[PDB]
Amino acid sequence: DKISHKIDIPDSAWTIGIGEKFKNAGHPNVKYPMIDDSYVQGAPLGGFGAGTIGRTYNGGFSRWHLEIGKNKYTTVYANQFSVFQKVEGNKDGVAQVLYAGEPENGYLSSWKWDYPKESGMYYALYPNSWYTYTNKDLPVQLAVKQFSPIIPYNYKETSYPVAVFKWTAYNPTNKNVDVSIMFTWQNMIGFFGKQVNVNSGNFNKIIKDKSKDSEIVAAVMGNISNDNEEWNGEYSIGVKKVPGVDISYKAKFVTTGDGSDLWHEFSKNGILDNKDDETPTKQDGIGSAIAVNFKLQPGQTIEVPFALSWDLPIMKFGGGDKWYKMYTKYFGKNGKNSFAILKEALNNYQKWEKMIDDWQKPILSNKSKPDWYKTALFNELYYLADGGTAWENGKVGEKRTNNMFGLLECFDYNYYETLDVRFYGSFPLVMLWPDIEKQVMRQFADTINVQDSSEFKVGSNGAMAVKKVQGMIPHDLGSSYALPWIKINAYDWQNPNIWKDLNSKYVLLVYRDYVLTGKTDKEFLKYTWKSVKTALDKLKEMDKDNDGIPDNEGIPDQTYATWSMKGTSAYCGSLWLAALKAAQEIGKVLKDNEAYIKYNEWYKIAQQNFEKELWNGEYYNFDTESDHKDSIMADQLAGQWYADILRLGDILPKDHVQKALKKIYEFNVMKFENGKMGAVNGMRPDGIVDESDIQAQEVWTGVTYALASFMKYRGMTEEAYNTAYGVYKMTYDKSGKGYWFRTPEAWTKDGNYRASMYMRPLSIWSMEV
Ligand SMILES: OC[C@H]1O[C@@H](O[C@@H]2[C@@H](O)[C@H](O)O[C@H](CO)[C@H]2O)[C@H](O)[C@@H](O)[C@@H]1O
Ligand SMILES: [Ca+2]
Structure with a gap:
């Protein structure tokens, strides 16, 4: 583990091995039905009133609280970070999904699943969590720091439906190594709130923003409808360009297929096709992919931030009442603002980190x-x-x-x-x-x-x-x-x-x-x-x-x-x-x-x-x-x-x-x-x-x-x-x-x-x- 020294995880962080099994887990002690989602959990992402997403220590986006007041534990297998690495001079590299598991059914079968055991750790000190990746077959070691800006005496950012993923990559070897990191995300519009044709109208598009000091590339995953319902809105994933990395993307791949449309690109050289297919879907689940690729020299470190936003402006309760969520005060209510939320995160995350450090420090x-x-x-x-x-x-x-x-x-x-x-x-x-x-x-x-x-x-x-x-x-x-x-x-x-x-x-x-x-x-x-x-x-x-x-x-x-x-x-x-x-x-x-x-x-x-x-x-x-x-x-x-x-x-x-x-x-x-x-x-x-x-x-x-x-x-x-x-x-x-x-x-x-x-x-x- 040479990556742990390159990032700053507090000693009080709760820790567990990625893919670790736990033998002594408790279960409910009552006879009536009661939630038991297992011990595969992690620190949630998302602000107050935004709906939260529980990403587990195994790396999956599995505990969904986006429908306000409901708990839905299911791994959306297309939602992942994946890595490609090739030592300079080698014929072939390796591609690996950073998830200690695999899908239950046959979708995404071509992706490389089952991130191996004893090859990394999960750490959590809310609102921060971390994964480190220290794998025999990956010469470059990686770590990510993930968080939402949960800040005492702050009622603005604390509400945001947003998460930052600050990646750090380090090359402890004596050869150059090509590295790609890819964020994949399913267009989850209709994941809840639609009784039939759950994917219908869903479409993805690529947004590029280049305002001199900052280059951002994002996928926005929404729906063709302009209906103001609790199911409608936008999800977005993206990355901010840093010196010495290049960005590639794929607006649309099929989540309800074998996944090879995406993976044959990524597993070859870690570079995607840069196709912006904005065509709506009917029955197929679709998703988006954002990748960065870079060359690391011996002993070199690089830091690149990804982000995730979800503009789902309306919450609905069982009795029929529909309300706007708090964050809509700062970004609007029309459900077409996922990119704006994402951009704010990618250009301000360093300030948010130091704000979080400022209120944890007196105790730590x-x-x-x-x-x-x-x-x-x-x-x-x-x-x-x-x-x-x-x-x-x-x-x-x-x-x-x-x-x-x-x-x-x-x-x-x-x-x-x-x-x-x-x-x-x-x-x-x-x-x-x-x-x-x-x-x-x-x-x-x-x-x-x-x-x-x-x-x-x-x-x-x-x-x-x-x-x-x-x-x-x-x-x-x-x-x-x-x-x-x-x-x-x-x-x-x-x-x-x-x-x-x-x-x-x-x-x-x-x-x-x-x-x-x-x-x-x-x-x-x-x-x-x-x-x-x-x-x-x-x-x-x-x-x-x-x-x-x-x-x-x-x-x-x-x-x-x-x-x-x-x-x-x-x-x-x-x-x-x-x-x-x-x-x-x-x-x-x-x-x-x-x-x-x-x-x-x-x-x-x-x-x-x-x-x-x-x-x-x-x-x-x-x-x-x-x-x-x-x-x-x-x-x-x-x-x-x-x-x-x-x-x-x-x-x-x-x-x-x-x-x-x-x-x-x-x-x-x-x-x-x-x-x-x-x-x-x-x-x-x-x-x-x-x-x-x-x-x-x-x-x-x-x-x-x-x-x-x-x-x-x-x-x-x-x-x-x-x-x-x-x-x-x-x-x-x-x-x-x-x-x-x-x-x-x-x-x-x-x-x-x-x-x-x-x-x-x-x-x-x-x-x-
Ligand atoms: O554990 C104490 C809290 O119990 C909650 O009451 C109920 C349960 O104890 C019972 O088994 O089932 C019903 C189902 O709705 C629960 O409400 C109370 O809500 C709390 O006031 C109490 O502190
Ligand atoms: Ca009395």
Whole structure:
């Protein structure tokens, strides 16, 4: 490996061999159907709201999230980088597709498939990933750095449906070597959104742009139709000329054929025919090819950038709503702008690299923190772009002030912005993209007083219930199968209108967003104040025994639905105490003196009764009235965790918080599979896992990373990182269960999972507060 020294891969990058097999991969632990796309995954490409493309460590473009809110795992075999190499003076060279695999059927059979094992590595530190190619039969060694410009405090480039592929080639041998690199791409218009004649009208054309300082050559793959539908638009691939390379191209080859129309050209001398056949197709899949060829002298290095753009301006949801994607603000809405996006990328990618380096550097250069933590911290961010992210720039047919946003809970549980989950999972947004975070929270503020009196069938039991109650925060803001932002509370397995934790978490989130953006945004507090008071006032009504705290009802009425709570619980109780103190503070800031007095009085009463009812001398009991009431809950002090972040001080005694945390570490962590798998949710004081419900026996990834941050705030540094380590190990390490770039909600003791590709573990960013 002589190429690794020529490029700059951080030591914290997650790593795996190209073509490596993995023996210990987990699978779903539930009986109902659930996504399992295997461990062949990689860092996604594409901005927020653009639709994402998952290119795997084997090199294939395989995890497609271009249809917003859907996960489609299939390798489009025509989408590849390929290499040609011939030592100067030799009769023949070699051509090889850079993909550790081959097609299932007979299409593209003439191409050289099956990139061999132990001949390269994949690296990932999101938003960057890398492939190196160190192959006995390729004298020139190659590496590519691939990324999308995902940049904190940047709401423009971060939206772009674009990827850059910066290739570096180096000749360690004592002879001249001719090298070509070819990017192939299928015209994917009609890949989704067309019921019949999926390729019909598709056509490809070559664009050349030569404006003195920059020569760019591109293929634009679109359709003859000018219909404004979610299926229509353009894909583009291209390259920028550098000194000492030449560009060749082929606008049209057939993806539904043996591939020899392209390969007989490329495998001969690495130079394509330069034909621009713009003729539309009927039934055949078609594609485009862009190649660069150059001669490398001994010890010479060269750098050449390729790019990929996709202008698919319209997203459609199952209920019929069509919206424009965010990036259309900067490039237009007519779906004929793929080249413009590509060009911007090819002329600005160096600036984007240094912008990405600037926001990774403070963490990467802090040598007090171990590399494994940085691996998780950065790579967990995959989910912001990959989580079916919806970011609208107008409804199709309708200007606008605000641009609504939605990130999914996950793909299995297809709900936008599930509030109880985002309580943990929204840390990256508040810390790095706060305007998005504030917009999401204003969306929630606007739903508080919505009333929908029509009834729905509750799934868990069968009972009927009202859809949306006035003054109760919704579970979610809809589903991609229905109408995001318009039809809220898509979740129906329980009744969220009786939950005792959503209203509190809502309040805590509002105050969080004020505090972590510098305590300067009074206007955000004013926008949300009515909703905050309403939310706490309705929750106070659920105090049935008059201890000042809402009663859990021994039925599904919080996040841990099936692991029931009854009476005063540590979880809902602590969240309530923290929320009341939060509302106190907003009262002071806004000079709402009566609110302050009221929430102060409610707080003191509730605080005293919480302590008296739940403190047992070592920890806080799970609740007052359950069968499993003395179980040790990992999340028992969620309220105090948020209070630390919100700088609200001690809601419970320091000494008692410390003991409770030491108990959780000693029990839920250390006595669960030797602390190598995170914190199991519930442990009985005899040191045996609480078996009363499946959720109690689960490790929740995001709860565990949140728990770790809480320990870190309280000076338990060793305990924090040891707790987090088990989650890192399970996700990323060769000894874990192969969940890289699909971190699940949960696992049980056997390492098998529930709900891959989950929002909650983004809570790791709470460790950076
Ligand atoms: O894992 C906790 C989260 O669970 C989600 O609830 C449901 C599943 O637990 C259940 O098995 O199936 C339905 C199918 O739609 C899921 O919604 C909730 O959405 C989350 O609020 C909860 O935190
Ligand atoms: Ca009560």
